[PDB]
Design a protein around this ligand. Structure first.
Ligand code: NA
Length: 1055
């Protein structure tokens, strides 16, 4: 019912931001829960997401509430009833602690699994005698490795046999450390890859391991493991001494928590050195006569690579085991361990290799929960196991809160925090899943997962790609799809984060969020010098793209996490962060964090370890945060309205996720004057359809073109088929022809030729070809291609310096357009802004106030030009909804005129119990932090400034009167003749008072709030009577104070 103008004045609950609400280490009371949630209502917060966080925190309650005990459950039930009563959306995390999906009700068999194996050799012309050695059952990341500085499970996978050539066995070398110490060489091939030799350090560092032989040996591959390389700083190089003193490097070895295998063109030498460029024990160092899968450990998913296409193999033209030769002996293994097999005869020089595949546990656990609530992360690739995990977990909260308080009331939502559970690469249905998703049998290729080259290096590399891709597919469907299904079956919504930070595991961070009701990302605070963490830009852009393409519309972000900056933020410091989230596509900030306040006496009290935000009822400016939250709620409202408008669908390939591709370097490829969404393989192949020359999704997302970016130079036949079909159906593609498929699917299904035909059709050579009813522009210049399609820029601007960024969001409704602009610079800008819109008279909408303002404009030639002044870091909405009566309006120029400076004496009254005197008189406005009085100097809280002032004008009726406060530390709420005229919380600190003043004498009261910083510093001073309590120390007595109070000058200004 309400108009957009009314909603903008008083945003609805759906527009109001949420907070994270950590319960710190049992420091919980019902009394505090109510005061927390009543504070959130006062301040306009729309919801909260609870965590029971088992991080070591001093006990400030009479007794800690232990997770899921009766008193804890009654506290949570109370929280749920208070959120219901107060109309706050309550969410919980998907596991005890905060991530991911794990707990002690996960049976050992259902934990995360890694592939393990034993190997045996046979003659052929012999019945295998005895027992196949059991694969390792150790919990840990690989084979026999343990987790770093007791629950276990060993499963079966299968038994494979395949012929292999008799190979030149290698002598045991002399192991010389860098110094010349003689090491136990045999321990380098030991059954214990974690236990080998300790290296001595030589001057100039360069620890090395020389392997000197008595004859030349031909080496093709090497495996190395250095225990505890845990940032994880160490490289390694393999060199060969032909003479013992001249070295030619063979290849480098990236080291990690799992072994590293490299393969190369053969080398004949009697001396091999492992050099460890930056107790150093080398657990394994093994040279191989044969060619192994180069870097198989990472390709098999035991450890991540940033870019799997970058793992360029040696060009040695070798071919390994013939896949057709591989035999499945799974049948023949008996529980006894014996194998009943008649090994068929082989050519001479060729023996049998029998591979016994099994699985064992990673052992990773949910965090941070108490031991009783800590247990295995559920197998993320097994939908049934995930469902059992989550149905049980939800059952616990229905018991705790009561079933009436889970679903439509009380607990409304589930949060899947960003995932980091280690590197799992097996799940029991894997062979069926691989067959169904990739279209061919993985069984003949499994030996590649253990290092054994199958077919050509390229075929094994493509199989491993296909294997990694199946794991990524199952993560999205079997974990995140199941989580959303179970939540929905229980009337819950899902807030869903993904990778967030570079590439912690396999998976696509759009697909991982495509099933969630609210795709979610994160943004940390950052110094303006340094800029944001790039991975978090990609994280948010991915999440926004999901919501646009799959129709969720809502885009959440874990907002404004801060590290080692105790209580050092007022809204003036935060605006640029939330504006960056807004302009990237976030429209539901979830503030990190609002720690639960269990007792009132300790101020500012508990914090989530070393992290901020510190946004709870103990914050110094907490009772004046409503205008800040209103700013976020008003911005979110407009940024949820209608649909996102974007012209470019940026296809980023089938390899690394967005936080991987752009974890360090931002996308350099994207348009500037046009908006864009990322599209992944699923979006490309399932959502996009032709609409004339456009590509549309069921959500209403609508694009002029697909851009081939990211890793799309490697493209699968399945993707290419869909792309060709959309082109032929009328769509435009901008990009250069892919150079290869990364997958074996098309070769295995016999579709060799078709990939090349489709490339030849879409990229015939001209570089700009009509293809069916569509068009392929063979360019990597997106804006020049859009120009050649006659697509005008959506937003652009003149009149600013070079390098000035004013990024934008474009929203669209049946009622008109909304552009969101952010001047990402401290310097004010005066621009002419060009919008691709017509027929509408623009207005500026200000989220600070909820008011709209008319603006001059000219409509002409398919665009509207608007002259804009933007303060430093100003964010503003340019709204095109009113039908334009005229095509040009030039508003009368408005001048500014200082009318008076409110200099002279002020009364100041200080919030009680804050170490300050009740009141002072200032002959002159002065920064309180420069005061001679320590109780004023170090004051944190609300100082109330008081004064009268004379007005000799009539205002409102065509002439306005502004109060400019000058410098303010840090925000100020202003009352004129008892009337609240607003609160100024960022520069320029200016408020419209024309309506509240009267002729003659007027009363003025200005409530200035600052941060806790100064009172914290004040408490470190020698002799200090301590006002504050925090868990750990925050500032040294050295620390520079923040400017505090009403600094001014305070001026009356007429238009
Ligand atoms: Na996160």
């Amino acid at each position: 019912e309400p108009s957009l103008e009314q909603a903008f004045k008083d945003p609805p609950s759906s527009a109001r931001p949420r907070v994270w609400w950590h319960w710190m280490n049992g420091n919980i009371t019902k009394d505090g829960i109510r005061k927390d949630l009543e504070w959130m209502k006062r301040v306009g917060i729309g919801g909260l997401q609870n965590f029971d966080a088992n991080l070591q925190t001093p006990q400030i309650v009479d007794h800690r509430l232990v997770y899921m005990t009766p008193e804890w459950k009654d506290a949570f039930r109370f929280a749920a009833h208070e959120a219901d009563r107060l109309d706050l959306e309550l969410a919980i995390a998907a596991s005890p602690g905060w991530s991911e999906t794990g707990g002690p009700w996960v049976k050992p068999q259902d934990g995360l699994k890694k592939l393990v194996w034993s190997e045996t050799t046979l003659a052929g012309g012999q019945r295998f005698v005895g027992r196949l050695a059991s694969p390792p059952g150790t919990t840990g990341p690989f084979q026999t490795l343990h987790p770093p500085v007791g629950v276990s499970y060993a499963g079966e996978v299968g038994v494979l046999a395949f012929p292999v050539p008799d190979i030149a066995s290698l002598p045991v070398p002399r192991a010389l450390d860098g110094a010349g110490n003689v090491l136990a060489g045999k321990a380098l091939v030991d059954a214990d890859i974690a236990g080998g030799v300790t290296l001595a350090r030589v001057d100039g560092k360069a620890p090395l391991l020389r392997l000197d032989y008595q004859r030349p040996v031909t080496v093709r591959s090497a495996t190395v493991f250095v225990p505890n390389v845990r940032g994880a700083a160490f490289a390694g190089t393999l060199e060969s001494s032909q003479d013992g003193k001249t070295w030619t490097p063979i290849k480098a070895l990236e080291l990690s928590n799992v072994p590293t295998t490299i393969s190369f063109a053969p080398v004949e030498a009697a001396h091999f050195r492992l050099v460890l460029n930056p107790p150093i024990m080398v657990g394994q160092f093994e040279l191989h006569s044969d060619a192994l899968v180069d870097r198989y450990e990472t390709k098999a998913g035991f450890v991540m690579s940033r870019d799997y296409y970058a793992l360029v193999g040696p060009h040695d033209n070798v071919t390994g085991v013939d896949p057709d030769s591989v035999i499945d002996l799974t049948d023949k293994l008996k529980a006894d361990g014996t194998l009943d097999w008649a090994a068929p005869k082989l050519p001479a020089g060729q023996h049998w290799r029998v591979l016994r595949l099994g699985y064992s546990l990673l052992g990773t656990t949910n965090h941070p929960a108490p031991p009783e609530a800590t247990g295995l992360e559920v197998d993320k690739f097994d939908g049934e196991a995930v469902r059992e995990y989550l149905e049980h977990y939800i059952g616990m909260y229905k018991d705790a809160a009561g079933p009436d308080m889970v679903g439509k009331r009380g607990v409304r939502a589930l949060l899947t925090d960003s995932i980091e559970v280690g590197e799992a690469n097996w799940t029991p249905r894997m062979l069926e899943q691989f067959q169904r998703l990739r279209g061919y049998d993985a069984r003949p290729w499994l030996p590649a997962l253990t290092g054994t080259l199958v077919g050509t290096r390229e075929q094994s590399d493509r199989f491993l790609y296909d294997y990694r891709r199946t794991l990524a597919d199952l993560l999205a469907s079997e974990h995140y799809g199941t989580v959303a299904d179970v939540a929905h079956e229980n009337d819950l919504k899902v807030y869903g984060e993904a990778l967030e930070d570079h590439r912690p595991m396999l998976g696509d961070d759009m697909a991982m969020r495509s099933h969630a009701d609210i795709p979610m990302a994160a943004l940390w605070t950052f110094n303006r010098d340094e800029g944001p963490r790039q991975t978090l830009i990609a994280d948010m852009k991915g999440a926004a793209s999901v919501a646009h393409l799959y129709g969720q519309n809502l885009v959440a972000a874990e907002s404004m996490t801060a590290s080692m900056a105790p209580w050092a933020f007022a809204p003036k410091d935060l605006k640029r962060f939330i504006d960056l989230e807004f302009v990237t596509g976030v429209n539901r900030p979830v503030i990190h964090t609002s720690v639960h306040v269990p007792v009132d006496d300790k101020k500012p009290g508990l914090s989530l370890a070393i992290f901020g935000q510190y946004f709870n009822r103990q914050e110094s400016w907490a009772e004046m945060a409503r205008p800040w939250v209103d700013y976020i709620a008003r911005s979110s409202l407009l940024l949820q309205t209608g649909r996102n408008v974007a012209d470019v669908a940026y296809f980023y390939g089938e390899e690394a996720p967005l936080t991987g591709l752009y974890g360090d370097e931002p996308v350099a490829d994207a348009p500037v004057r046009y908006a864009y969404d990322y599209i992944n393989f699923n979006a490309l192949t399932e959502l996009l359809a032709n609409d004339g020359e456009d590509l549309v999704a069921p959500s209403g997302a609508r694009y002029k073109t697909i851009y081939l970016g990211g890793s799309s130079s490697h493209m699968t036949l399945a993707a290419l088929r869909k792309l060709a079909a959309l082109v032929v159906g009328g769509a435009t593609v901008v990009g250069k022809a892919p150079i290869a498929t990364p997958s074996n699917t098309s070769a295995q299904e016999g579709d060799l030729t078709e990939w090349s035909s489709l490339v030849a059709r879409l990229w015939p050579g001209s570089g700009d070809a009509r293809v069916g009813k569509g068009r392929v522009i063979a360019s990597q210049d997106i804006e020049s291609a859009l120009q050649a399609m006659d697509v005008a820029p959506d937003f652009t601007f003149t009149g600013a310096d070079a390098g000035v960024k004013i990024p934008f969001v474009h929203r669209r409704d049946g009622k008109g357009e909304i552009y969101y602009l952010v001047n990402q610079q401290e310097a004010a800008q005066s621009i002419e802004a060009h919008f691709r819109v017509t027929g509408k008279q623009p207005e500026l909408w200000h989220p600070e106030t909820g008011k709209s303002e008319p603006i001059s404009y000219r409509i002409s030639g398919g665009e509207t030009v608007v002259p804009l002044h933007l303060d430093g870091d100003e964010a503003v909405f340019v709204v095109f909804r009113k039908a334009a009566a005229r095509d040009r309006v030039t508003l009368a120029r408005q001048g500014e005129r200082a009318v008076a400076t409110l200099d002279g004496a002020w009364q100041v009254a200080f919030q009680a119990d804050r170490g300050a005197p009740a009141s002072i008189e200032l002959a002159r406005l002065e920064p309180l932090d420069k005061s001679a009085d320590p109780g004023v100097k170090y004051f944190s809280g609300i100082a109330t400034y008081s004064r009268n002032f004379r007005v000799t004008g009539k205002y409102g009726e065509g002439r306005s009167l502004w109060l400019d406060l000058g410098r303010v530390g840090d925000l100020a709420q202003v009352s004129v003749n008892g009337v609240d005229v607003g609160t100024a919380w960022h520069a320029p600190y200016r408020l419209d008072i024309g309506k509240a003043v009267r002729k003659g004498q007027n009363t003025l009261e200005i409530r200035v709030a600052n941060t806790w910083v100064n009172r914290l510093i004040g408490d470190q001073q020698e002799g200090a009577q301590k006002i504050t309590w925090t868990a750990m120390p925050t500032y040294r007595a050295d620390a520079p104070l923040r400017p505090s109070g009403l600094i001014g000058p305070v001026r009356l200004i007429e238009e």
